[PDB]
């Protein structure tokens, strides 16, 4: 389903995903990709660069294509991504970790 999007990398490892979004250092703050979960099959992960460090956010994709991130529900993964391009990801560390999604790592 998600294989038509350039930011979807399928079953890449957590370590590989982290290195992909960290490659350009803190200048790539907000750069992201989406992958299959490596430790919980059937689930997905948004991996993104935060101040040069990789962070990983679990996503649930329903059979209808809708996307849940913890308490937040979106009609699609694309809608979730656009939401976090416009509004900061509400992480626990608050303003010291402000991040909006920016670019993405293109799948090979």
């Amino acid at each position: 389903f998600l294989s038509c999007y350039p930011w979807f990398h399928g079953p890449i490892s957590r370590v590989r995903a982290a290195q992909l979004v960290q490659l350009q250092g803190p200048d790539a703050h907000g750069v992201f990709l989406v992958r299959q979960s490596e430790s919980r099959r059937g689930k997905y992960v948004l991996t993104f660069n935060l101040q040069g460090r990789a962070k990983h956010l679990r996503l649930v994709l329903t059979e209808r294509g809708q996307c849940r991130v913890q308490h937040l529900h979106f009609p699609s993964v694309v809608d979730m991504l656009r939401h976090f391009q416009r509004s900061p990801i509400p992480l626990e560390c608050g303003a010291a970790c402000d991040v909006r999604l920016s670019g993405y790592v293109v799948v090979v």
């Binding site: 992960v45 990983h56 913890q70 308490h71 990801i89 509400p90 992480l91 626990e92």
Partner: peptide, 8 residues
């Protein structure tokens, strides 16, 4: 491993 938690 570890995954991020959001403020709720």
């Amino acid at each position: 491993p570890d995954y991020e938690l959001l403020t709720e």
